[PDB]
Each structure stands twice: as C-alpha cells, then as structure tokens.
Amino acid sequence: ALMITDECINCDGCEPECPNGAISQGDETYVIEPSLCTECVGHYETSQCVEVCPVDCIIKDPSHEETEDELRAKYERITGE
Numbered sequence: 001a002l003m004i005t006d007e008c009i010n011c012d013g014c015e016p017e018c019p020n021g022a023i024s025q026g027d028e029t030y031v032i033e034p035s036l037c038t039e040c041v042g043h044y045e046t047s048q049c050v051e052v053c054p055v056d057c058i059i060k061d062p063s064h065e066e067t068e069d070e071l072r073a074k075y076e077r078i079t080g081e
C-alpha cells in the first residue's frame with residue numbers, strides 16, 4: 001500500500017482518482033486506508049493518486065509492504081470475482 005505524507009497540501013485531487021475509495025480527508029492531510037489500497041493493481045498500470053499529486057507526497061508505506069500478488073489478491077477481494 002501507499003501512504004500520504006505530512007507534505008500533503010489538501011488539494012483534494014487524489015480522492016476521486018482512487019478506484020477503490022481508499023482516500024479520504026484526514027485531520028491535517030488526506031489519508032490512505034491501506035486495506036483498500038491495491039497500489040491500483042488490477043485497475044491501472046500505475047498508481048492514479050501518484051499521477052495527480054502536485055507535491056509528490058504519496059509514497060510506499062513501509063508498514064504495509066505488499067507484493068504484486070498480494071495487491072492483486074486485495075483487488076480481487078474488493079471488486080469480487
């Protein structure tokens with residue numbers, strides 16, 4: 001999963017880009033719910049939130065390091081099949 005750092009400027013741009021609804025507004029920044037963050041695998045070849053973030057404050061979360069398979073499995077759990 002990814003995380004949003006303290007450098008987030010609360011621009012609102014990443015929330016509508018998440019296919020899994022993993023992003024919401026937090027206390028001082030936007031936040032990723034790691035149980036919904038597939039790093040976009042299954043939907044897109046690259047993270048959509050990273051693509052729109054104006055200040056590059058979306059990074060791998062080292063306390064949720066996931067393989068492509070784990071992420072895929074997560075994608076399948078969220079969307080079904």
Ligand code: SF4
Binds near residue numbers: 020
């Ligand atoms: S990487 Fe993809 S799944 Fe994770 S929060 Fe960003 S847009 Fe959502």
Ligand code: SF4
Binds near residue numbers: 004010011058
């Ligand atoms: S796109 Fe980047 S700066 Fe804007 S709300 Fe999301 S994480 Fe914060």
